[model samples]
Target chain A: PLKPEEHEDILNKLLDPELAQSERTEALQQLRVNYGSFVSEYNDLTKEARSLSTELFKLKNAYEESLEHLETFKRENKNLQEEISDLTEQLGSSGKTIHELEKVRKQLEAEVEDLEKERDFYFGKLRNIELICQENEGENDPVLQRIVDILYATDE
Target chain B: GPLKPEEHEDILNKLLDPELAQSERTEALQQLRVNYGSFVSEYNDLTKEARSLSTELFKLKNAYEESLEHLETFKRENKNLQEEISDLTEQLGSSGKTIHELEKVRKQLEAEVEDLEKERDFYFGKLRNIELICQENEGENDPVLQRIVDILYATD
Candidate 1:
């Protein structure tokens, strides 16, 4: 673009009586061409800068979106890991409980067997008493008769 | 080569001064044209440099954004895998709890079965003892007592 000084100088020369008319006209023509050329170059540069700015903006936006996505994924991963850890611990605890239950079951079974043996001994004594009463049935002793009556009462 | 705005303005004021000689005005105009030409050249060079730098920046930014996108994709896949791990761990927890409960029930059943077996043994022992006594005292058994033994044996 022509400076204001250049424009003023050119204007002054065109009106100067000392310069030849042809030389003055040539100077003005040259000035006009230079101004046009400068404008053209400035427009081209502006267009180029605008296009670059647009491209840069798009790249920056894409980068930001990708960064956001990465952050989201990281957050999700962290949550999942925490849940997994908790569940795994729960599983371990449950397994321990199951092991303890099995141990208790075995102990209980053994205790039941011991109780069964004692019960058998008592039942055997009862059967022996019944036999003794039967052998003494005809003695007619009051104690023996009473015992026989008590033992044989349920038989009928 | 580019004149400052104020300098250009000053020069224009000087040119408009009617007291200035025609030769001086012509010389100033020539100088202005030369400066304008030089400014255009410098501007063009700067513009080219800006275009080249901006293009490189765009490429670098594109590569960076692509790398970020790839990282995002990788992180997302990892997140998905972690989620799967979390689900499986939860399933393990559930299965473990179920196993633990089943084991508890099985323990109780075992205890009950053991108790039942012991009671059966007690009854069998009583029956055996009674049979032995009857054999030793063959015909001496009271008829009622013999009938009771028979009933007990039959139940056994």
Candidate 2:
């Protein structure tokens, strides 16, 4: 099957073509002895190719399965990342709202505290006025009695 | 001792004493009334302001509670997000390892197939060389070379 000169070229690749006649005879003997070795060696490679094909299938399926699984995870990861981003922004708004509410709450509490103190002070003054109005020493004095009467009459 | 101060207390003391002249006591009482009117009005307004401040404080407390709850909801969601992210991160790492193991197995198997291919060619070249030498003796009708040709083509 080789080009005419490549016959010897092929021979040179494996051994020699222009050797002595006895050498050719010995080469024939070598082939006769080693033909089985060569045939079985081909079969050995055939078996191994079969094994390699099976193993390559296993890896292909395994790699493809993981690649598919990883893709889904990556998709889920992208969605989760978005969810986290939204939550983070929500937390930001909530925190700012809380701070603003707290500021107003503190200011309102201060106003309540000041109002409570003033109310207590006014109660103390009213109590003293009621005590003075009730004294028996001013019973006969019209002006004092009028003050007492007016003070008592003004209440609902 | 209405609400003014020590000066008003002195007027009150004189007004309450029946032994004091009625004109002097009545005139002092009128003077006290001038100051007491504003005090009473101020106390009334104080009660109104206190009530208003208390109402506002209650509203603010409600807002504070609402804001705190809002923040807590987002906090819980973000915490959930963190947990999910942690789980996925570890899973992705393990997935990478699995792919590496698969790739490693395939790489070595492919290399072995390459070596087996080289060996098959080595043995095939040896037979081809023997067949070529047989061709050199084509006209001789040699018996061993004929059998070698038969084995090479394997017609039987």
Candidate 3:
């Protein structure tokens, strides 16, 4: 019970051999028995094919996504390792600097100790001069007496 | 003409056999297509989910890397602080040592000051004693001085 146009449309499509094979047999059977059922069945089958295509597309997309993630991880890991290496080098340099400073500190301490000893020797010399002055005070000779006077008169 | 009617029956029976029914075959094909389509759709959704998960994972990895960078920065800063602390502590210790040495010098100076005070007192006493000796010498020389005067008058 196809309209004239519908009948012509089917005839035209059927003339294309490549397009006719998929549905011609089923369509012809349904057309002979029930054209409405034929249309409905064809639509459903086409929808199924579309759905399958969408699924395949999604699977491919997933694979691509996984690959992209792996690449990112590799890049990040490489960069991090480089940064860690740089930091480690800096830390090593700092440690060396600290060691050098400690070495200098020890040297400075030794010099300070030497200065202290030199100061003590000066104090002892001053004490010896005081004792000599005390012993010379009672001299009778003119030059010796003069020396005694000068030593006793000198400002401390 | 009636002899070939049995051939038509066999061909029709073959066409309508349950196993080979065109309707059944078409239904099976439609079901396969529908299943394939559903599989495609399901797979597409899975791919989308995986893509989203990858995005989330990327963000998480970035955050993790950033935190690690922050920690490394902290470690570097802490290392610098530790070195600075060591340097400061060394400076403090050196200053304490300098102060101790300075105290020793100060004590030596105080001792010297005490010695100077004692020497000043000693010189003061010596000056008084020398003045007394000068006076005594002048007194003792008076008799000798008179005798030299007599001898000079006699020679005249």
Candidate 4:
């Protein structure tokens, strides 16, 4: 009897080579079909995943841009707040200055009125003297000539 | 059967039916490896990367939307700041006008006070002239004039 390798070799030779090849080919056809479908499905998955990765990049970039915009807006808000606060204080200071100026005006107005009253009182006495001189002297001599001249000195 | 979504080793295992003859089983196994060699090696890694990217995309999208909401809050804050700035500007303008008006009043009061001071000096000069004239020609018979001169001299 032949040894085991020789025995298997003879058995394979007895089988028709082309027919066995065709039989094995037919048997694996279904598996090939299944694997073909698997590869096709995997292609679909990779394709979809590629698009998803692009979208992921887009989402990441968009998130970064939004955060940058938010930071810029927050910075603007901070400066604007400071500007408003500073403007508010300036307005208050202007108002304070106006109040002080108004008080000064009030005091000046009272002082002016006091001077006016003093001037008018003296003018009344001098005018009465002039009336007495005009009535008695009959416009002859001028004891109050210098007074009338100087007192009636008008400002242009 | 319902339309399936995806499959993995179970589908391949089913195709690897061991009940089949050794020749068929081993050939199928060889066929499985030969045809899907790339998928077997790299599919899981790709799947892991895709799922990681997907999860990252989800988290990024969530944060992106949150950033947008925060941006909206910043916009509102900016709007309030601008509004307050406008109000402050208006108030500052109002204060400026008041200051302008008050300054004019102060200038006018200063001028009026100067005018009153000048007028008071003129009256005071006339009174002094009259007092000297009355004293130079003072007569015992003129009680009213003497009394007026005395009154004028008594004025501080």
TM-score for all models, in order of appearance:
0.56, 0.45, 0.35, 0.75
Clashing pairs in 1: none
TM-score of 2: 0.45
Q: What is the C-alpha RMSD of each candidate to the true structure, in Å?
A: 7.7, 79.2, 17.1, 9.2
- lDDT of residue A107 for candidate 4: 100
Error (Å) of candidate 4 at residue A21 is 7.7
Label model 3 with its docking quality class. Answer: incorrect
True contacts kept of each: 0.17, 0.01, 0.00, 0.69
Tell me, by DockQ, which candidate is best: 4
Expressed as tens digits, the lDDT of each residue in B21-139 for candidate 2 is 75675476456445444544544555565556556555555655555565555556556767976765565566555555555655555565555555444444444554565576668
**After best superposition, candidate 1 residue B84: deviation in angstroms?**
3.9
Looking at model 1, residue B107 earns an lDDT score of 66
Clashing pairs in 2: none
**Ranking of candidates on TM-score, top first:** 4, 1, 2, 3
Clash pairs detected, candidate 4: none
- Best-performing candidate as measured by lDDT: 4
DockQ score of the complex predicted as candidate 3:
0.03
**Which 10 consecutive positions of candidate 3 chain A have the poorest summed lDDT?**
A30-39
Residue B118 C-alpha lDDT in model 2: 51
Residue by residue across B32-128, what tens digits does model 4's lDDT show?
Answer: 3443454554666778878998898878878988998999999898998899999999988889998999999999999998888887887777788
What are the per-residue Cα lDDT tens digits for candidate 3 across A1-156?
Answer: 344445445434433334444465554443344334433444565565566556556655655555555555555555655655665565556556556555655655565555455444443433443444355545434533543454346455
Is candidate 1 or 2 superior in DockQ? 1
Q: What is the TM-score of chain B alone in each candidate?
A: 0.59, 0.81, 0.51, 0.69
| DockQ-based CAPRI category assigned to the predicted complex of candidate 4 | acceptable
lDDT of 3 by residue, B17-136 (tens): 334655554453443334334544554565566566556555555655565565555556555555655555565565556555655655565565566555545644544454444444
